[PDB]
Design a protein around this motif. Sequence first.
Motif: not given
Length: 341
Positions: A143-159
Amino acid sequence: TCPFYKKIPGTGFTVDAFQYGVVEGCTAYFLTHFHSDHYAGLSKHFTFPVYCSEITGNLLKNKLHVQEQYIHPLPLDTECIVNGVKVVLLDANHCPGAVMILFYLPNGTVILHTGDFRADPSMERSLLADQKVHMLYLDTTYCSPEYTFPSQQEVIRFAINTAFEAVTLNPHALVVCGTYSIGKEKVFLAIADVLGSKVGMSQEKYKTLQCLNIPEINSLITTDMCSSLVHLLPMMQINFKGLQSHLKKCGGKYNQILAFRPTGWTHSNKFTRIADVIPQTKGNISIYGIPYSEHSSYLEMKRFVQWLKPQKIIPTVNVGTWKSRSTMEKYFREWKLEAGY
Ligand code: NI
């Protein structure tokens, strides 16, 4: 003593409250999911009703050895009565078996306890669409605006691409994935699948995965390290000295380790996209930290709360300091005023 945010008013029900001994007046202990901050205190000696998902039931029975007579698994998306009170279990989009719980109080109040969740728009078309929710017990981990992250689907694609390329360039490289709890199985499963391998692991970790009703799982995992080029290891062991060590044990079958550390948020989320990630290299051993979250980003949380329009919000995470508490209350007010509920 068991804190107020673990008690459901007007029931004798508690949620994720197993480490305080007998709670005065609790007639039924709900468990949202099989992670140790939540189950802490459960064991073969517990003799009170536990309510949970079928998957979480399988883990209580086989890993903690809780006796079957105390485990009351419930199907999801199904109106069920528990000690005279209508409840529904919904998928929390967290780890395997993890649930949100809808409580329909005899007085007419409706309450949702999210357990641990990653808010998704798909939740807007579940049984929640169907009626008003008065109180929300909310996973506020990020619960704080600095916390962004990509979709799970993006991350799996990269891996997937990272591993496929490294192994094709060098057929004697080994892939290692860190783990310390259930969750994030998609990481090591998608990698294994792109490389035409089963995933190898210790006997304790194999037992844990066999509980999770994963379709075709016997085709996907094994206890035979030799036959497999994706290894799972304790997250503690994912570092240069502990990998080197492990690399010795494989007996010259591999010359290179490519290793993944599925973290939550780390501060380089504020500056770097998934496309521009790089590892730490000490020779032939490389370690990617990849931000695969099973908790809501700040924006995903915001959206779910603005859709739900609850009358009151009770945080279940980051509640231990007055500054965190105060900061959270400010965001909830912004959200409410922006959305007009
Ligand atoms: Ni959790």
